Structures are given as structure tokens and as C-alpha cells.
Amino acid sequence: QSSLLAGFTPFPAERAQAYRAAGYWRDQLLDSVLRTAARTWPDHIAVIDADHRHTYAELDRLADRAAAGIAGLGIRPGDRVLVQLPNTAEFAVALFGLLRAGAVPVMCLPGHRLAELTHFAEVSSAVALVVADTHRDLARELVRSHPDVRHVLVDGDAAEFLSWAEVTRAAPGPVPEIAPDPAAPALLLVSGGTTGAPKLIPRTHQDYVYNATASAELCRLTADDVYLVALPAAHNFPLACPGLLGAMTVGATTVFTTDPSPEAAFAAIDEHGVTATALVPALAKLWAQACKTLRLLQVGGAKLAAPDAALVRGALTPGLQQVFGMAEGLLNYTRIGDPPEVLENTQGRPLSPDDEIRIVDEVGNEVPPGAEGELLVRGPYTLNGYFNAEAANERSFSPDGFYRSGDRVRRFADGPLAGYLEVTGRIKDVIVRGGENVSALDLEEHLLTHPSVWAAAAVALPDEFLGEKICAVVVFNGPPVSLAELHAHLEQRGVAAHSRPDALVPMPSLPTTAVGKIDKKAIVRQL
């Protein structure tokens, strides 16, 4: 019954064995993080929010009960379930509840709407949807277009749907007996991409437990730390970097908050004795100019400018840690004892000894040490393909199996910042068409959302009226489609006529560099 394996690109056997031999992959299921924590620190507080708090022993039972309830609706191991919940202790009840039923949760962010969730349901073959009332009209239009979503569970006023409280609490059961492959997907994360269809990222039990454990070790988390979840709990960053899960691997307390604004957050920190939190640079800067127990302030999600880094660890805490990471895998951290110049001018270095980074040029070659290039990555917790996204996989990965991040970075080869990364921007691909600076990359993403377009390349051709015209070189799926049809598709998606291709050219396949990126200079010297 599991197309779970159908959408999944596994880790190659030899790399998997290597990661097991090195102690990264420990053969235990994701939900065992709670189980083991519950056996070790039964009476330590596990999770806190405004109105509730649960010890590890109390949380362990709740997840068990939630799991029996979920299995009771007919949700079976491998089934994917869309999840969209606020920052509540209940988020933890749902995550491990779902995991213990053997379901594979899809971690949706609060800013996702019907278009996103609909596409997620389609990609994941989701059979259910968990939501909170602070969304019902959303669930209604979702099940209409995707009947396979047989269950809607609402934390709050359920209306016509199921009550999350009813189903998970006071619903007897035996707790289902499951046995997933730990090298198979435990959950699906959402990719913070472009426009663009968002993608789903499969994280295996093996690599996600490692991602949390290793991160919590690096951050030196102990049972005494109190981590504040200020970002949306379903995002990779506060979920496992080290986040709630990493916190749970050491028996630390996790505090959820709905309001990460300075006044409310400063209040929460003093009350619960918060020692750690993660923010984005905009929010870190806001807290700083709003101004102990805090000792670790992680900042990630976009580049912290060094003056703003300065502000942050002069006004908030010297215990700044820069984090450059992605839901797809690779995490770069500054280390806990690192010199101030490293905290303020770098975005860290890889989490794992066996994280492999390549910094390459536009041809696909390894750039000279210290030069800028595109970051490519492969390692013990980096995906080998997106879930159920064969066209995106051909496009997004190296032939060797390195993920192409689209990030422009340099690794300093000399000086006091040696060994560390700096993020300098995004790889760009601009076509100068008339008075418009058109992005080939986002034009290509738009064209790819057509069911007839398998692969696409927007290329610049010298033109006498426009300077450069836009040639869409396309690999079609079924029968080809005319430019006017593609133009109609682009307009419905909101692309103006000044960014639509002037010409359409079909090819049986697109040429690529030795890194898998479309070889556009080659496509030009044809056509």
C-alpha cells in the first residue's frame, strides 16, 4: 500500500553502511527520541506553552494515546498526513502521535495556503490533514479536489470534521505495532523555494535523528537548557537544528510561543529561564534594539550582516551562533567557543565530518580556494532526491548525487576565518530583454508547472530589437504545446508579457555541464 518507496530516492548502500560505521546512523526510529528521553528523564519538563506543560513521561503517554486514536481512523504505516499547527505543546503530541502510528507527517508552515497544501496533498498522496482553528474552509476545498484526503482532524471547533481532542485523547487503543525501515522516510519537510512549486523533502529516521543529536551535541545542550521555539515549529530550523528534537535528545525543556515579538519573548525568557532560542536576522535585530539566562542565540534563515551581528552580541548575548542551513540537509554552524570575528563574519562550517561540500563555477569546476561559486552538497543527512518529483530531481542534482543549493558562497582559505563559509548571495541567470531584466530561473520554474513541460531552459539570444530575446528550449512530456498555449499558462500564473519567451524550441533532452546544470552556452551555439 506504500508508494512511500515509490517517491523516495534512497541513500546508496555503501554510503549508508559508512554512516552506520561512523556512528551517525544509529538504527533507531524517530519516535524513539521521545521514548528514550521518557525512560531517562521521566519527570523533567519536556514541553511548555502558555497554558500547558508536560513532563517527558506525560508526553510519552499522550503520543501513545494519540497514535492509537490515529490508527483507529484507519491511517496505516507509510500513509502521509499533512500537518499545519501553531506553536503549541500539542505540536509535539501530534508529531510523535503521528510517528507512532507509522504515519509520515508533512511539515507545513503557517504561511502555506490552499494552493500549497493542494500541491502537497497531490505530491504526498496524503490521506489526512491536521489543523487548528487559529482553516476549515481550507480543509473543505482541499478534500473536494483531493478525495484521498479522507480525514480532517481539527484542534478546536471541528464543525463537520473530526475533533483532534476527541480522536487523540480518551480514545482507547493498543498503540499500533509498526516497523518502518529506519533508512526510509520518517517525515517530509517543505522546501523554502521559489514560484515555482514548493517541493517535499524526505528525511529518513536515520538522518533526522542524527541531524538533531549531532546538532544538540555541537550546541552543547544539556538537560538544564530551556529552548524557546520562536520560529514556526514545523520548519527544519527550530524542529531539529537542534530545535525541539535535539533538545529532546538531552532531556532539556522546550518552550513554544505564539508571539516572538520582543515584549512577549523577553517575558517568556524570564519566566521559563530560557537559555537558548533560534531567530532570523530581521527578528534578532528587532530584539536587540528593544533592549541573564540566555547563552545561545542562533541566527539563520538569511544572512546576518556583520554590523547586525555586532549589535546582536553587544545588546543581547555574546553567545551568538550563525547557522547556514537548508531543509534539504547541509547544516553550517559556528562552534560554541568560536572567536568573535568568526561569530560575526562567517556563516559557520559543516556539522558532520563527512559532509562533502563543493564550491563550483558556472562551467562546473572546483573554484580556487577562497573564490565564490555555487555550493553543492552531499552527506549523512542530505537528501538524494525530492519526494515524488522525478523532473525536479533530474534538474536539481549532480550526476554524482550532490544537491545543487543555488547559494553563492566562498570558503575562506587563509586568515582567522579560515575553514569557514561566507554566503554572498544566490546564483542568478538574467536575460536582458528590452528594458526588463528577466530571470531565466524563475521563468523556467513557471514553465515547469505545465504538465507537458518535463524540462525547460530559458536562453538568451542576441536580438536586434530587444538586445536579447528569450528562447524557451523545452523537453516535452506528451505531445508538444504551442508557444501561445505556454504564453496562456504563463499569464494565468501572473507573468507579464515582458518576461514571456519569444520563441519555443523542443529538444529530446537538454545538454548539461559536469554538475548537471543545463549547459546554456551550448544550447546557444545551436538553435
- Sign, CA torsion 206/93/107/427: negative
Q: Cβ contacts of residue 283 below 8 Å, gap of 6+?
A: 230, 260
- Walk me through the domains of the chain, giving residue ranges and CATH numbers: 1-428 (3.40.50.12780), 429-527 (3.30.300.30)
Taking CA atoms, 472 is separated from 50, 51, 362, 483, 502, in Å, by 53, 55, 20, 9, 8
**Radius of gyration of the chain from its Cα atoms, rounded to whole angstroms:** 24
Q: Is 223 helix (H, G, I), strand (E, B) or coil?
A: coil
Lookup: cell for 16: 549508508
In sequence order, what DSSP letters do the residues of 350-380 get, joined into one string?
ESSTT-EEEEE-SSSPBPPTT--EEEEEE-T
- Written as nine digits, the cell of 321 is 551562533
Q: Residue 252 in contact with residue 221, Cβ under 8 Å?
A: yes
**Residues 389, 477: Cα–Cα separation, whole Å:** 14
Question: Among the residues of 404-480, which ranges form H helices?
Answer: 440-448
Whether 486 contacts 480, CB under 8 Å: no
CB 356 within 8 A of CB 381: no
Question: Cell for 413?
Answer: 582559505
Angle at 364 between CA 358 and CA 365, to 5 degrees: 65
Asked if 288 and 312 count as a contact pair (C-beta separation under 8 A), the reply is yes
Contact 470, 501 (CB under 8 A): yes
Q: How many residues does the chain have?
A: 527
- 310: phi then psi, degrees, rounded to nearest 5: -60, -50
Query: Partners of 297 in the beta sheet?
Result: 277, 320
Q: In angstroms, rounded to a whole number, what is the distance separating the alpha carbons of residues 110 and 131?
A: 10
198: left (phi over 0), alpha (psi -120 to 50) or beta: beta
For the sheet containing 356-360, what is the strand order?
Answer: 356-360, 373-378, 403-411, 421-426
Pairing of strands 421-426, 403-411: antiparallel
- Cα dihedral value 467, 468, 469, 470, nearest 10: -150
Question: Residue type for 196, please?
Answer: G
SS3 239: helix
Method: X-ray
Q: Identify the three-state secondary structure at position 288.
A: helix
Return d(Cα 456, Cα 97) in angstroms, integer. Answer: 41
What is the number of other CB atoms lying within 10 angstroms of the CB of residue 275? 21
Alpha-carbon distance of 229 to 107, in angstroms, equals 15
Q: What distance in Å separates the CA atoms of residue 62 and residue 407, rounded to the nearest whole number? A: 41
Please identify which residue in the block is written with the cell numbers 487559529.
134
- In the chain, the amino acid numbered 472 is A
Task: Return all residues near 274 (Cβ < 8 A) that are at least 6 apart.
Answer: 226, 227, 228, 255, 268, 293, 294
Nearest to 333 by CA among 366, 299, 356: 299
Q: How far apart are CA 431 and CA 419, in angstroms?
A: 35
Q: Which three cell numbers stand for residue 107?
A: 511539515
Output the CA torsion 99→9→410→342 (10° steps): 20
Q: What residues contact 520, with CB distance under 8 A and at least 6 apart?
A: 429, 440, 457, 459, 460
DSSP 8-state code for residue 397: B
- Lookup: cell for 332: 553550517
Question: Which of these, 329, 323, 332, lies nearest to 303 by C-alpha position?
Answer: 323
The residues facing 455 across adjacent strands are 475
3-state DSSP of 300-347: CCCCCCHHHHHHHHHHCCCCEEEEEECCCCCEEECCCCCCHHHHHHCC
Write the CB contacts of 147 (distance below 8 Å, at least 6 apart in sequence): none
Strand ranges across the sheet with 276-279 = 53-55, 45-48, 253-256, 226-229, 276-279, 296-299, 320-325, 331-333, 349-350
In sequence order, the β-bridge partners of residue 325 are: 331
Say which residue the cell 517568556 belongs to: 268
With a CB cutoff of 8 Å and minimum separation 6, the contacts of 217 are none
Instruction: State the cell numbers at 451.
Output: 504538465
**Whole-angstrom distance, CA of residue 74 vs CA of residue 103:** 11
CA distance 177 to 196: 39
Compute the Cα dihedral for 333, 337, 341, 344 and give only its sign: positive
Distance CA 83, CA 130 (A): 5
Spatial contact of 404 and 394, defined as CB atoms under 8 Å apart = no
DSSP code, position 12: P
- The identity of residue 520, as a single letter, is K
- Report the distance separating Cα 411 and Cα 370, nearest Å: 5
Residues 440 and 499: their CA atoms lie apart, in Å, by 9
CA-nearest of 516, 250, 242, 277 to 402 is 516
> Quick check: helix, strand or coil at residue 468?
strand
Task: Give the amino acid at 1.
Answer: Q
**Residue 156 backbone zone (phi > 0: left; psi -120 to 50: alpha; other: beta):** left
Among residues 124, 28, 84, which one has the least CA distance to residue 232?
84
Closest alpha carbon to 198 in 118, 259, 257, 253: 118
Largest CA distance in the chain: 75
Chain gaps in the chain, named by the residue before each (C–N > 2.5 Å)? 134, 291
Q: Per-residue b/e over 363-396, b at no fewer than 16 CB within 10 Å?
A: ebeebeeeebbbbbbbbbbbbbbbbbbeebbbbb
Q: b/e string for 334-345 if b means 16 or more Cβ within 10 A? A: beeebeeebbbb
Separation CA 349–CA 356 (nearest Å): 11
Reduce the DSSP state of residue 472 to 3 states and report it: strand
DSSP string, 477-501: SSS---HHHHHHHHHHTT--GGGS-
Yes or no: say if 105 and 202 are a contact pair by the CB < 8 Å rule.
no
The angstrom resolution of this structure is 2.3
SS3 237: helix
Exposure b/e, 102-128, CB count within 10 A at least 16 = b: bbbbbbbbeebeeebbbbbbebbbbbb
**Quick check: 386 and 392 in contact, CB under 8 A?**
yes
Contacts of 477 (CB under 8 A, 6+ apart): 451, 452, 453, 454
Contact 175, 67 (CB under 8 A): yes
Measured CA distances, 426 to 115, 166, 199, 384 (Å): 26, 47, 18, 22
| Alpha-carbon distance values, 374 to 46, 395, 407 (Å) | 40, 15, 6
d(CA 97, CA 103): 9
**Whole-angstrom distance, CA of residue 229 vs CA of residue 48:** 10
Buried-state track 140-171, b at ≥16 Cβ within 10 A, e below 16: eebbeebeebebbbbbeebeebbebbebbeeb
Residues 79, 205: Cα–Cα separation, whole Å: 15
Three-point CA angle 250, 168, 259, nearest 5°: 60
For residues 514 and 366, give the distance between their C-alpha atoms in angstroms, rounded to a whole number.
Answer: 11
Q: What are phi and psi of 195, to 5 degrees?
A: -115, 75
Read off the C-alpha cell for 166: 476527541
